[PDB]
Design a protein around this ligand. Structure first.
Ligand SMILES: Cc1cc2nc3c(=O)[nH]c(=O)nc-3n(C[C@H](O)[C@H](O)[C@H](O)COP(=O)(O)OP(=O)(O)OC[C@H]3O[C@@H](n4cnc5c(N)ncnc54)[C@H](O)[C@@H]3O)c2cc1C
Ligand SMILES: Cc1cc2nc3c(=O)[nH]c(=O)nc-3n(C[C@H](O)[C@H](O)[C@H](O)COP(=O)(O)OP(=O)(O)OC[C@H]3O[C@@H](n4cnc5c(N)ncnc54)[C@H](O)[C@@H]3O)c2cc1C
Ligand SMILES: [Cl-]
Ligand SMILES: [Cl-]
Lengths: 256, 256
């Protein structure tokens, strides 16, 4: 059920976040935005947790973007992985963060906090994302400036993607947000959207249910707050996988 | 001079050939087709050898395609590398296998035997290769059918390259050759070209110095034989790096 894959590269962003890549089974297929069970072998039972696949389905490796919880059963150990180590990966990806469950639209907003950024790494590398949308707004809301992950990638490297680059300079807009200190965009994503600061910064029109589509991935609080905002502006959720709406959303984690 | 990189993936083709990938230094730049010194740390002095870079310069990792010599000082050890191991990689790539040293042409023939295939893995992934040529003929001459490396990649996977695929189906022609047993294309590359079997199979015209360009990488014998053939047909070699000709060539190894 859970075959081992091998850890390739590992990068630590902060004391709380790190990324890693693994090998990918020949028969492993997924839709961009989906999550899969991953984990570790132990002295007893394997430790297994849901993780977004932070890479596109056309890519040769898998990537994961992970929290580090000091006493978390999985991540207390996962944080110490090294190239060559084994990480268990499931066979059955699933999840709600699918552009196929978004009604036709013009602007695609990817609203993520913390590790909620993970599925966006997949989505922004899907060619179909750009076939369907005029603008793709990539966000990450974090606490401090130093917490922003993949910043150089988004700001410098991705606009040079030998293959996606030309399109990305035209369509991909990066909007980092920081809560706990002064910054160009200071606040929760809900607050930056509530008074239209996000749209003003990006040069986009006031939110409109006919035009704007959302994918939302974050804390229980951010999901509740953003859903309340969008619902109050006339946006309708996708009610289940396979049924389209103006937005889709998925818990980045649960407060256990 | 020789910083360590980390081994990522390893694949054994036969008892005599294997491939591996490594991390790449942020400041490491190269022209497609070039070689670099690589090697291993030891109990004394590092073991260092010239290796073609078997990947394109736009890619995030390096790949190498290696012989296994039973009592070879480097490869007796290199064959046992595992994910996570360190491989030394030089800073100063060089070499003659540069499309920039080919006069304008129509068809690009990549004539390789054994590990001579390595630089072609770089060249066939360079977008500039296809800007400059109507057809790219990818060869590997080997002894037995089972020795052909990357066969599924060339025949099945590469024509589906999410980004290079459309172009490759149009322009990339794979021509495997085998000497020691019956096969669609049986013989040395020199022999398959001497009587035009290669051109007939591929549906290309008789060799013509105005139109056909060659990059040649292989054994001392194959280089001598192919140069004699091409020279007798009026093709002129590039005399040095930076001065263009109808063909370029480089030793895949030396008989020590
Ligand atoms: C659909 C889904 C997708 C998920 N995708 C990811 C992902 O891409 N990356 C990832 O790191 N985790 C993801 N998670 C959370 C993940 O399943 C684990 O909870 C996480 O690996 C921590 O495991 P643990 O055993 O160390 O801590 P656990 O005992 O699961 O969690 C303990 C506490 O850690 C905190 N926590 C757990 N995960 C996070 C998190 N991601 N961000 C902030 N705080 C967290 C919460 O306070 C939680 O109560 C996802 C969860 C679900 C349900
Ligand atoms: C410009 C250049 C590029 C090279 N690129 C590559 C490359 O991409 N991949 C690679 O494996 N080697 C390549 N080589 C050969 C390489 O430098 C080493 O010789 C090889 O790694 C074997 O090292 P060793 O110490 O094990 O054997 P060494 O003592 O170097 O060689 C001993 C014997 O092994 C045989 N041999 C060595 N290399 C090969 C080979 N590649 N194919 C068939 N027989 C060989 C010869 O009989 C040689 O006399 C290249 C050499 C040069 C000069
Ligand atoms: Cl929020
Ligand atoms: Cl030959």
């Amino acid at each position: 059920a859970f075959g081992a894959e091998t850890v390739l590269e590992v990068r630590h962003w902060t004391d709380a976040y790190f990324s890693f890549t693994t090998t990918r089974d020949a028969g492993f297929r997924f839709e961009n935005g989906q999550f899969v069970m991953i984990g570790l072998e132990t002295e007893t039972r394997p430790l297994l947790r849901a993780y977004s696949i932070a890479s596109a389905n056309w890519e040769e490796h898998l990537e994961f973007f992970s929290i580090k919880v000091p006493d978390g059963p999985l991540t207390s150990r996962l944080q110490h992985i090294q190239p060559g180590d084994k990480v268990l990966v499931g066979k059955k990806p699933t999840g709600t963060l699918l552009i196929s469950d978004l009604h036709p639209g013009r602007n695609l907003y990817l609203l993520g906090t913390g590790t909620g950024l993970a599925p966006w790494l997949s989505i922004i590398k899907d060619p179909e994302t750009y076939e369907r949308f005029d603008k793709v707004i990539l966000t990450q809301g974090v606490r401090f400036v130093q917490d922003l992950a993949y910043r150089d990638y988004f700001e410098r490297e991705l606009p040079q993607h030998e293959f996606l680059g030309d399109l990305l300079r035209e369509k991909l807009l990066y909007y980092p947000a920081v809560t706990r200190e002064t910054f160009a965009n200071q606040g929760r994503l809900t607050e930056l959207m509530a008074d239209g600061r996000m749209q003003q910064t990006l040069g986009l029109p006031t939110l409109d249910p006919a035009n704007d589509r959302f994918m939302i991935c974050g804390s229980p609080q951010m999901l509740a707050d953003l859903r309340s905002l969008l619902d109050s502006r006339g946006f309708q959720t996708s009610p289940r996988i396979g049924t389209p709406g103006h937005y889709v959303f998925e818990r980045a984690f649960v407060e256990k």
